[PDB]
């Protein structure tokens, strides 16, 4: 099995020779946290982990083990895909559904919105895309044209348009079109954009929804753990998307947003079509992080 | 960072901050050796000339007519686009965009709304239409109003993407064929927010159009733009300006005193 060149030397050279000195341990979690600090892994959760799998190996009795290499190696495997979820996991749909795409500019919100649009049709749901997003130039003709293309009705947000009067258009169209699934992709905000993260409490309050979607790029660096901390704790993240893992970044970044807010990573984008969404598999995340 | 006390813990405090900046493994380790090797005890002073002199390997001139500009999807290649719009306008020039991302909804009528905003013309074709010759027809409509710049915005497009990193190729050779000295500036719009991809991004699109600038976008938010210091070491290639916000004011030449000031905050 090859890991990462990082990894691979890191175990690699333990491996054959007998019981290896507490130094020899001690190298090779230092590199397993460099390895996951290489993949984005924000640096405290990348140093937690590591201390996680230090104490889990030492109750395998590493230190007594011919094959440290095979003890070590299958303490950070199992935790880090336990640590990403465990199975793949979808959301459970009620008889309605509202649900809510949050996160940073330029993320995937509008694109994944439709995507799931998609997806849920195929399905036999029958949902409606809100364009709540009045701010960034040609928003909401963005999310028209791709309701176009998977043949699911659009509502635009007007200029100005209060929380209360969106709640009762949109239910008025969901009802008048018995549409279960309705999917409101908001603006891309920073998470210390006081006044826009409090824009969307608020739409939250009034809307009600049952799912708060953050949609977290893959590339995403460390600030990940901060950026999943505030749209927690300011409006509450019921679950994940990990969008354009079709590059190649290594996707670290997932295990910061879940680290801090224990939430699911439902779904994984990988392209920029309408059919480019899969169930999240957290072995799979796991085995593409350790650069298998 | 304990600027004064006992220099192996000033080292360490060091990495971390560089670390949770997003400077990456290697480049981190480079400067703390580089650092410990001076013999220097003066760590601040010599942590920072070592980090300000890497970020340059003040109104920015362009070198000709035409920018291209060049990332992945959602860096933030279309505003700042708009933002280099009113930059230049500022300083009394000419300019003229092209939307050459005809391939994503509402990828070329986005451009336009900041074209309408900002009085600046908007060269535009239906969705699907060749970005190649759209770009040429472009060049030869600056050249032909005596225009002082035209921006090139582009598709986001993966890295990754064999194919249409091969697409942008053909972007740059249309301008050339149209004139022959363009484009001098190939621009990298890269997100603030990224980590170690960043470095991979800027590489392939150097290999693929070769930059002449990077700009980074998303100053504003938490994120310290780390990744440019691996990127400039590695590539040499000069950080143009920053943006720090969704308005067009909103972009600032690259300040690297400034932004090293920043990044060890
Ligand atoms: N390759 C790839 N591209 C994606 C994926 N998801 C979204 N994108 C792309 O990334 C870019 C940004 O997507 P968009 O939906 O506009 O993002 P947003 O979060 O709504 N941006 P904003 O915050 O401005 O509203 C688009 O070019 C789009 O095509 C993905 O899984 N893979
Ligand atoms: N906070 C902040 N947001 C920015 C900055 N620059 C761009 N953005 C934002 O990031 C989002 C994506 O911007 P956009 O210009 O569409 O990016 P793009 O690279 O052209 N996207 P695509 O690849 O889909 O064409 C927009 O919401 C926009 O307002 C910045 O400096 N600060
Ligand atoms: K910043
Ligand atoms: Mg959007
Ligand atoms: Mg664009």
Known sequence: ?292 | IPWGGNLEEVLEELEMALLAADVGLSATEEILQEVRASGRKDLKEAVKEKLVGMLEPKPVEPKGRVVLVVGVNGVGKTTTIAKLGRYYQNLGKKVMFCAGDTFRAAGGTQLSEWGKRLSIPVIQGPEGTDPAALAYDAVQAMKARGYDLLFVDTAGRLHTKHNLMEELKKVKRAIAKADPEEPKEVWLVLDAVTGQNGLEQAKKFHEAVGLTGVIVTKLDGTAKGGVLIPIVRTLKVPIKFVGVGEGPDDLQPFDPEAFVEALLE
């Open chain 1, 1 to 292: 099995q090859q890991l990462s060149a990082r990894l691979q030397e890191a175990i690699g050279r333990l491996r054959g020779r007998g019981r290896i000195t507490e130094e020899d341990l001690k190298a090779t979690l230092r590199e397993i946290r460099r390895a996951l600090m290489d993949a984005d892994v924000n640096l405290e959760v990348a140093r937690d982990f590591v201390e996680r799998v230090r104490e889990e190996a030492l109750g395998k009795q590493v230190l007594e083990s011919l094959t440290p290499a095979e003890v070590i190696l299958a303490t950070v495997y199992e935790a880090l895909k336990e640590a990403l979820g465990g199975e793949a996991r979808l959301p459970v749909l009620k008889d309605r559904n509202l649900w809510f795409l949050v996160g940073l500019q330029g993320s995937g919100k509008t694109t994944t919105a439709a995507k799931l649009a998609l997806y849920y049709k195929g399905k036999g749901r029958r949902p409606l895309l809100v364009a709540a997003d009045t701010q960034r130039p040609a928003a909401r003709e963005q999310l028209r044209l791709l309701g176009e293309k998977v043949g699911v009705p659009v509502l635009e947000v007007m200029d100005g348009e209060s929380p209360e009067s969106i709640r009762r258009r949109v239910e008025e169209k969901a009802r008048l079109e018995a549409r279960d699934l309705i999917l409101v992709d908001t603006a891309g905000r920073l998470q210390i954009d006081e006044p826009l993260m409090g824009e969307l409490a608020r739409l939250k309050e009034v809307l009600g929804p049952d799912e708060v979607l953050l949609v977290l790029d893959a590339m995403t660096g460390q600030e990940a753990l901060s950026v999943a901390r505030a749209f927690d704790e300011k409006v509450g993240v019921t679950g994940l998307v990990l969008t354009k893992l079709d590059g190649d970044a290594r996707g670290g970044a997932a295990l910061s947003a879940r680290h801090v807010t224990g939430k699911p990573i439902y779904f994984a984008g990988v392209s920029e079509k309408p059919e480019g969404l899969e169930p999240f598999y957290p072995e799979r995340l796991a085995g593409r992080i350790l650069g298998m």
